[PDB]
Amino acid sequence: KGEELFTGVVPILVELDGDVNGHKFSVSGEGEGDATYGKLTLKFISTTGKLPVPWPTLVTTLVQCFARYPDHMKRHDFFKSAMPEGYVQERTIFFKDDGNYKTRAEVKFEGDTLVNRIELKGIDFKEDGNILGHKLEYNGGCEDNVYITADKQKNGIKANFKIRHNIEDGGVQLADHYQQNTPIGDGPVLLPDNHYLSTCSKLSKDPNEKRDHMVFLEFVTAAGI
């Protein structure tokens, strides 16, 4: 059972290769996840200098297998059931009145470590917009619940949710997330009934960190059944 792989604290490594309007950047992340508490503690670093986009816009792209599914919902945890082979997570994130991200990631175990290797491509972003202009507050913003539905055709799941980033000069920047997850292996997975994940994140900085970075804390819990 893939759930047995998350009984304790699991180390995490994240790799993101990004490209926004043709400007390449790379982010390396590490930390740990405790599915018993739906708790994620991560630190992310840009290895290519100042990012061309705000950190809050990459939060969702930068491991839902660490969601806490209560006992009465364990049958609906697709993410852990796909482990250790893992799953492919793909998203299109439409930023209202701005560009969009298209992301493809492989979430799988490499040894005792849960790894998230991501490719991100952003296009049609406006230099005078909130994203390329770095006009978003540094926080998790209003995070709508992640509504998950089964996709038996792909033996996986789909998800939909909006992120609302506060704009420093007042207002909000909507980010419409459209998500699809498919298992990497051919083994059996758990196709869930309709449910959602509740998220709460806290973004902070490391005083000793010289590079553009993000210290990240998240609690994710399933509900709706």
mmCIF file of all heavy atoms in Angstrom, residues 51-83:
data_model
loop_
_atom_site.group_PDB
_atom_site.id
_atom_site.type_symbol
_atom_site.label_atom_id
_atom_site.label_comp_id
_atom_site.label_asym_id
_atom_site.label_seq_id
_atom_site.Cartn_x
_atom_site.Cartn_y
_atom_site.Cartn_z
ATOM 1 N N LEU A 51 14.000 35.751 -9.635
ATOM 2 C CA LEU A 51 12.985 35.116 -10.456
ATOM 3 C C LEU A 51 12.280 36.153 -11.329
ATOM 4 O O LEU A 51 12.114 37.307 -10.926
ATOM 5 C CB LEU A 51 11.954 34.404 -9.587
ATOM 6 C CG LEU A 51 12.383 33.135 -8.853
ATOM 7 C CD1 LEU A 51 11.188 32.549 -8.119
ATOM 8 C CD2 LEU A 51 12.978 32.116 -9.811
ATOM 9 N N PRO A 52 11.854 35.766 -12.536
ATOM 10 C CA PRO A 52 11.053 36.681 -13.361
ATOM 11 C C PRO A 52 9.594 36.766 -12.946
ATOM 12 O O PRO A 52 8.869 37.616 -13.479
ATOM 13 C CB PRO A 52 11.191 36.086 -14.768
ATOM 14 C CG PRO A 52 11.391 34.630 -14.533
ATOM 15 C CD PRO A 52 12.184 34.521 -13.254
ATOM 16 N N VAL A 53 9.143 35.926 -12.018
ATOM 17 C CA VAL A 53 7.753 35.944 -11.566
ATOM 18 C C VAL A 53 7.740 35.905 -10.044
ATOM 19 O O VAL A 53 8.738 35.530 -9.408
ATOM 20 C CB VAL A 53 6.946 34.762 -12.154
ATOM 21 C CG1 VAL A 53 6.927 34.836 -13.677
ATOM 22 C CG2 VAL A 53 7.521 33.434 -11.683
ATOM 23 N N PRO A 54 6.621 36.288 -9.429
ATOM 24 C CA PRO A 54 6.550 36.263 -7.963
ATOM 25 C C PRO A 54 6.467 34.844 -7.430
ATOM 26 O O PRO A 54 5.805 33.979 -8.009
ATOM 27 C CB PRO A 54 5.267 37.049 -7.651
ATOM 28 C CG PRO A 54 4.897 37.747 -8.931
ATOM 29 C CD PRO A 54 5.404 36.863 -10.021
ATOM 30 N N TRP A 55 7.140 34.612 -6.305
ATOM 31 C CA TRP A 55 7.070 33.308 -5.653
ATOM 32 C C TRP A 55 5.642 32.825 -5.429
ATOM 33 O O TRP A 55 5.382 31.632 -5.661
ATOM 34 C CB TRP A 55 7.821 33.354 -4.314
ATOM 35 C CG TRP A 55 9.320 33.340 -4.449
ATOM 36 C CD1 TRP A 55 10.172 34.394 -4.283
ATOM 37 C CD2 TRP A 55 10.139 32.211 -4.774
ATOM 38 N NE1 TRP A 55 11.470 33.991 -4.484
ATOM 39 C CE2 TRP A 55 11.477 32.655 -4.787
ATOM 40 C CE3 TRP A 55 9.871 30.868 -5.054
ATOM 41 C CZ2 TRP A 55 12.542 31.804 -5.073
ATOM 42 C CZ3 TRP A 55 10.928 30.025 -5.334
ATOM 43 C CH2 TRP A 55 12.248 30.496 -5.342
ATOM 44 N N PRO A 56 4.693 33.654 -4.987
ATOM 45 C CA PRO A 56 3.333 33.136 -4.758
ATOM 46 C C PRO A 56 2.719 32.471 -5.975
ATOM 47 O O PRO A 56 1.884 31.570 -5.817
ATOM 48 C CB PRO A 56 2.548 34.388 -4.340
ATOM 49 C CG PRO A 56 3.576 35.296 -3.751
ATOM 50 C CD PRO A 56 4.834 35.052 -4.541
ATOM 51 N N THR A 57 3.098 32.881 -7.188
ATOM 52 C CA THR A 57 2.524 32.288 -8.390
ATOM 53 C C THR A 57 3.073 30.898 -8.680
ATOM 54 O O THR A 57 2.506 30.190 -9.519
ATOM 55 C CB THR A 57 2.763 33.192 -9.605
ATOM 56 O OG1 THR A 57 4.165 33.256 -9.902
ATOM 57 C CG2 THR A 57 2.232 34.593 -9.344
ATOM 58 N N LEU A 58 4.149 30.491 -8.010
ATOM 59 C CA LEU A 58 4.739 29.173 -8.187
ATOM 60 C C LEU A 58 4.402 28.214 -7.051
ATOM 61 O O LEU A 58 4.776 27.039 -7.120
ATOM 62 C CB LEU A 58 6.260 29.297 -8.314
ATOM 63 C CG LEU A 58 6.774 30.154 -9.476
ATOM 64 C CD1 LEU A 58 8.273 30.374 -9.352
ATOM 65 C CD2 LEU A 58 6.438 29.508 -10.813
ATOM 66 N N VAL A 59 3.696 28.678 -6.017
ATOM 67 C CA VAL A 59 3.470 27.852 -4.833
ATOM 68 C C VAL A 59 2.767 26.553 -5.210
ATOM 69 O O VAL A 59 3.222 25.457 -4.859
ATOM 70 C CB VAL A 59 2.672 28.640 -3.779
ATOM 71 C CG1 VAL A 59 2.051 27.697 -2.753
ATOM 72 C CG2 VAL A 59 3.581 29.654 -3.095
ATOM 73 N N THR A 60 1.642 26.652 -5.923
ATOM 74 C CA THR A 60 0.880 25.453 -6.256
ATOM 75 C C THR A 60 1.665 24.521 -7.170
ATOM 76 O O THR A 60 1.500 23.299 -7.099
ATOM 77 C CB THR A 60 -0.447 25.828 -6.919
ATOM 78 O OG1 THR A 60 -0.196 26.539 -8.137
ATOM 79 C CG2 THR A 60 -1.293 26.690 -5.987
ATOM 80 N N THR A 61 2.511 25.074 -8.039
ATOM 81 C CA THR A 61 3.317 24.235 -8.920
ATOM 82 C C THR A 61 4.416 23.526 -8.136
ATOM 83 O O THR A 61 4.627 22.317 -8.290
ATOM 84 C CB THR A 61 3.911 25.084 -10.044
ATOM 85 O OG1 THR A 61 2.853 25.670 -10.812
ATOM 86 C CG2 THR A 61 4.785 24.239 -10.954
ATOM 87 N N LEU A 62 5.115 24.261 -7.280
ATOM 88 C CA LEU A 62 6.167 23.690 -6.453
ATOM 89 C C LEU A 62 5.580 22.734 -5.419
ATOM 90 O O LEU A 62 6.091 21.634 -5.209
ATOM 91 C CB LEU A 62 6.954 24.801 -5.760
ATOM 92 C CG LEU A 62 7.767 25.712 -6.680
ATOM 93 C CD1 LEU A 62 8.223 26.957 -5.939
ATOM 94 C CD2 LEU A 62 8.961 24.961 -7.246
ATOM 95 N N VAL A 63 2.901 18.560 -4.165
ATOM 96 C CA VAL A 63 3.092 17.234 -3.590
ATOM 97 C C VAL A 63 1.870 16.865 -2.756
ATOM 98 O O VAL A 63 1.970 16.625 -1.553
ATOM 99 C CB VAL A 63 4.383 17.175 -2.753
ATOM 100 C CG1 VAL A 63 5.599 17.234 -3.665
ATOM 101 C CG2 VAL A 63 4.427 18.315 -1.738
ATOM 102 N N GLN A 64 0.710 16.822 -3.415
ATOM 103 C CA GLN A 64 -0.551 16.581 -2.724
ATOM 104 C C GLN A 64 -0.638 15.192 -2.106
ATOM 105 O O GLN A 64 -1.587 14.922 -1.364
ATOM 106 C CB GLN A 64 -1.712 16.807 -3.693
ATOM 107 C CG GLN A 64 -1.853 18.262 -4.117
ATOM 108 C CD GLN A 64 -2.845 18.461 -5.237
ATOM 109 O OE1 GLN A 64 -2.921 17.657 -6.165
ATOM 110 N NE2 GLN A 64 -3.611 19.542 -5.162
ATOM 111 N N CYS A 65 0.326 14.313 -2.378
ATOM 112 C CA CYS A 65 0.389 13.034 -1.687
ATOM 113 C C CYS A 65 0.635 13.189 -0.191
ATOM 114 O O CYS A 65 0.516 12.203 0.543
ATOM 115 C CB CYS A 65 1.487 12.175 -2.306
ATOM 116 S SG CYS A 65 3.063 13.046 -2.466
ATOM 117 N N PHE A 66 0.985 14.386 0.275
ATOM 118 C CA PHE A 66 1.145 14.649 1.697
ATOM 119 C C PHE A 66 -0.116 15.219 2.331
ATOM 120 O O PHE A 66 -0.075 15.650 3.487
ATOM 121 C CB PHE A 66 2.325 15.594 1.927
ATOM 122 C CG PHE A 66 3.656 14.956 1.674
ATOM 123 C CD1 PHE A 66 4.337 15.180 0.488
ATOM 124 C CD2 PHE A 66 4.222 14.118 2.619
ATOM 125 C CE1 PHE A 66 5.560 14.582 0.253
ATOM 126 C CE2 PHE A 66 5.441 13.520 2.391
ATOM 127 C CZ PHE A 66 6.114 13.753 1.207
ATOM 128 N N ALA A 67 -1.227 15.234 1.602
ATOM 129 C CA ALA A 67 -2.499 15.631 2.186
ATOM 130 C C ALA A 67 -2.917 14.623 3.246
ATOM 131 O O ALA A 67 -2.743 13.413 3.079
ATOM 132 C CB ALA A 67 -3.575 15.730 1.106
ATOM 133 N N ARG A 68 -3.461 15.128 4.349
ATOM 134 C CA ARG A 68 -4.022 14.262 5.378
ATOM 135 C C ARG A 68 -5.434 13.874 4.961
ATOM 136 O O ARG A 68 -6.334 14.720 4.926
ATOM 137 C CB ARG A 68 -4.028 14.953 6.736
ATOM 138 C CG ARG A 68 -4.533 14.059 7.865
ATOM 139 C CD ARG A 68 -5.494 14.791 8.787
ATOM 140 N NE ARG A 68 -6.281 13.870 9.601
ATOM 141 C CZ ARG A 68 -7.338 14.224 10.318
ATOM 142 N NH1 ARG A 68 -7.764 15.477 10.349
ATOM 143 N NH2 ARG A 68 -7.989 13.299 11.016
ATOM 144 N N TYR A 69 -5.626 12.597 4.633
ATOM 145 C CA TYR A 69 -6.954 12.056 4.389
ATOM 146 C C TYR A 69 -7.449 11.405 5.671
ATOM 147 O O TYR A 69 -6.855 10.409 6.112
ATOM 148 C CB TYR A 69 -6.925 11.038 3.250
ATOM 149 C CG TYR A 69 -7.045 11.655 1.873
ATOM 150 C CD1 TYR A 69 -5.967 12.300 1.284
ATOM 151 C CD2 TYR A 69 -8.239 11.591 1.163
ATOM 152 C CE1 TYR A 69 -6.073 12.869 0.026
ATOM 153 C CE2 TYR A 69 -8.355 12.154 -0.096
ATOM 154 C CZ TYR A 69 -7.268 12.792 -0.658
ATOM 155 O OH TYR A 69 -7.376 13.355 -1.908
ATOM 156 N N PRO A 70 -8.500 11.927 6.317
ATOM 157 C CA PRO A 70 -9.028 11.256 7.514
ATOM 158 C C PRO A 70 -9.364 9.796 7.253
ATOM 159 O O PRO A 70 -9.523 9.386 6.099
ATOM 160 C CB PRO A 70 -10.278 12.076 7.854
ATOM 161 C CG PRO A 70 -9.998 13.431 7.289
ATOM 162 C CD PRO A 70 -9.208 13.189 6.036
ATOM 163 N N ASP A 71 -9.471 9.009 8.327
ATOM 164 C CA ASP A 71 -9.700 7.573 8.187
ATOM 165 C C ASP A 71 -10.896 7.274 7.289
ATOM 166 O O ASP A 71 -10.833 6.379 6.438
ATOM 167 C CB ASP A 71 -9.907 6.940 9.565
ATOM 168 C CG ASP A 71 -8.620 6.838 10.363
ATOM 169 O OD1 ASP A 71 -7.541 7.141 9.810
ATOM 170 O OD2 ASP A 71 -8.691 6.454 11.549
ATOM 171 N N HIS A 72 -11.995 8.010 7.461
ATOM 172 C CA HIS A 72 -13.204 7.732 6.691
ATOM 173 C C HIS A 72 -13.078 8.122 5.222
ATOM 174 O O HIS A 72 -14.035 7.911 4.467
ATOM 175 C CB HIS A 72 -14.404 8.452 7.319
ATOM 176 C CG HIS A 72 -14.432 9.927 7.064
ATOM 177 N ND1 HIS A 72 -13.738 10.832 7.838
ATOM 178 C CD2 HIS A 72 -15.082 10.656 6.126
ATOM 179 C CE1 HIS A 72 -13.952 12.054 7.383
ATOM 180 N NE2 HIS A 72 -14.764 11.975 6.344
ATOM 181 N N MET A 73 -11.935 8.669 4.798
ATOM 182 C CA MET A 73 -11.713 9.055 3.412
ATOM 183 C C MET A 73 -10.510 8.374 2.776
ATOM 184 O O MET A 73 -10.214 8.647 1.607
ATOM 185 C CB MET A 73 -11.516 10.573 3.303
ATOM 186 C CG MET A 73 -12.716 11.397 3.694
ATOM 187 S SD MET A 73 -12.415 13.158 3.472
ATOM 188 C CE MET A 73 -12.083 13.241 1.713
ATOM 189 N N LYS A 74 -9.805 7.503 3.505
ATOM 190 C CA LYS A 74 -8.566 6.933 2.984
ATOM 191 C C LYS A 74 -8.782 6.230 1.648
ATOM 192 O O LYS A 74 -7.846 6.118 0.849
ATOM 193 C CB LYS A 74 -7.968 5.960 4.002
ATOM 194 C CG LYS A 74 -7.543 6.599 5.323
ATOM 195 C CD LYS A 74 -6.124 7.148 5.268
ATOM 196 C CE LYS A 74 -5.556 7.382 6.668
ATOM 197 N NZ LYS A 74 -6.405 8.292 7.487
ATOM 198 N N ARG A 75 -10.001 5.752 1.386
ATOM 199 C CA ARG A 75 -10.293 5.101 0.116
ATOM 200 C C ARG A 75 -10.211 6.053 -1.071
ATOM 201 O O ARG A 75 -10.173 5.585 -2.214
ATOM 202 C CB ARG A 75 -11.687 4.469 0.153
ATOM 203 C CG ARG A 75 -11.819 3.284 1.089
ATOM 204 C CD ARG A 75 -13.192 2.637 0.967
ATOM 205 N NE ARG A 75 -14.265 3.558 1.325
ATOM 206 C CZ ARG A 75 -14.700 3.763 2.561
ATOM 207 N NH1 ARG A 75 -14.170 3.131 3.596
ATOM 208 N NH2 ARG A 75 -15.691 4.626 2.765
ATOM 209 N N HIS A 76 -10.178 7.364 -0.832
ATOM 210 C CA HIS A 76 -10.242 8.360 -1.894
ATOM 211 C C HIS A 76 -8.915 9.081 -2.097
ATOM 212 O O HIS A 76 -8.874 10.129 -2.749
ATOM 213 C CB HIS A 76 -11.356 9.361 -1.587
ATOM 214 C CG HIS A 76 -12.669 8.713 -1.272
ATOM 215 N ND1 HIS A 76 -13.522 8.248 -2.249
ATOM 216 C CD2 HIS A 76 -13.269 8.440 -0.089
ATOM 217 C CE1 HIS A 76 -14.594 7.724 -1.683
ATOM 218 N NE2 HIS A 76 -14.465 7.827 -0.373
ATOM 219 N N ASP A 77 -7.826 8.535 -1.563
ATOM 220 C CA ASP A 77 -6.506 9.151 -1.676
ATOM 221 C C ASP A 77 -5.813 8.547 -2.891
ATOM 222 O O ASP A 77 -5.091 7.554 -2.796
ATOM 223 C CB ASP A 77 -5.706 8.938 -0.398
ATOM 224 C CG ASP A 77 -4.395 9.698 -0.391
ATOM 225 O OD1 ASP A 77 -4.016 10.258 -1.443
ATOM 226 O OD2 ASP A 77 -3.745 9.740 0.673
ATOM 227 N N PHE A 78 -6.048 9.151 -4.058
ATOM 228 C CA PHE A 78 -5.380 8.694 -5.271
ATOM 229 C C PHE A 78 -3.875 8.910 -5.186
ATOM 230 O O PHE A 78 -3.093 8.071 -5.645
ATOM 231 C CB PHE A 78 -5.947 9.424 -6.489
ATOM 232 C CG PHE A 78 -5.047 9.383 -7.692
ATOM 233 C CD1 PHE A 78 -5.125 8.339 -8.596
ATOM 234 C CD2 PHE A 78 -4.119 10.389 -7.918
ATOM 235 C CE1 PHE A 78 -4.298 8.297 -9.701
ATOM 236 C CE2 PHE A 78 -3.289 10.351 -9.020
ATOM 237 C CZ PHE A 78 -3.379 9.304 -9.913
ATOM 238 N N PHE A 79 -3.456 10.033 -4.600
ATOM 239 C CA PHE A 79 -2.055 10.437 -4.666
ATOM 240 C C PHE A 79 -1.141 9.379 -4.063
ATOM 241 O O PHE A 79 -0.172 8.944 -4.697
ATOM 242 C CB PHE A 79 -1.869 11.775 -3.952
ATOM 243 C CG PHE A 79 -2.774 12.861 -4.455
ATOM 244 C CD1 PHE A 79 -3.933 13.186 -3.770
ATOM 245 C CD2 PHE A 79 -2.467 13.557 -5.611
ATOM 246 C CE1 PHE A 79 -4.767 14.188 -4.228
ATOM 247 C CE2 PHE A 79 -3.298 14.560 -6.074
ATOM 248 C CZ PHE A 79 -4.449 14.875 -5.382
ATOM 249 N N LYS A 80 -1.426 8.954 -2.831
ATOM 250 C CA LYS A 80 -0.570 7.965 -2.187
ATOM 251 C C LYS A 80 -0.690 6.597 -2.847
ATOM 252 O O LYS A 80 0.286 5.841 -2.879
ATOM 253 C CB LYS A 80 -0.906 7.858 -0.701
ATOM 254 C CG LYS A 80 -0.712 9.150 0.081
ATOM 255 C CD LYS A 80 -0.944 8.925 1.570
ATOM 256 C CE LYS A 80 -0.845 10.217 2.366
ATOM 257 N NZ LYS A 80 -1.848 11.224 1.925
ATOM 258 N N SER A 81 -1.872 6.256 -3.372
ATOM 259 C CA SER A 81 -2.053 4.946 -3.987
ATOM 260 C C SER A 81 -1.186 4.767 -5.226
ATOM 261 O O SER A 81 -0.892 3.627 -5.605
ATOM 262 C CB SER A 81 -3.526 4.728 -4.348
ATOM 263 O OG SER A 81 -3.925 5.553 -5.430
ATOM 264 N N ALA A 82 -0.771 5.861 -5.865
ATOM 265 C CA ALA A 82 0.088 5.785 -7.040
ATOM 266 C C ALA A 82 1.558 5.605 -6.689
ATOM 267 O O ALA A 82 2.372 5.392 -7.594
ATOM 268 C CB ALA A 82 -0.078 7.045 -7.890
ATOM 269 N N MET A 83 1.916 5.687 -5.417
ATOM 270 C CA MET A 83 3.297 5.559 -4.985
ATOM 271 C C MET A 83 3.662 4.095 -4.792
ATOM 272 O O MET A 83 2.791 3.252 -4.559
ATOM 273 C CB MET A 83 3.506 6.331 -3.685
ATOM 274 C CG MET A 83 3.238 7.820 -3.817
ATOM 275 S SD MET A 83 4.342 8.607 -5.004
ATOM 276 C CE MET A 83 3.490 10.160 -5.269
#
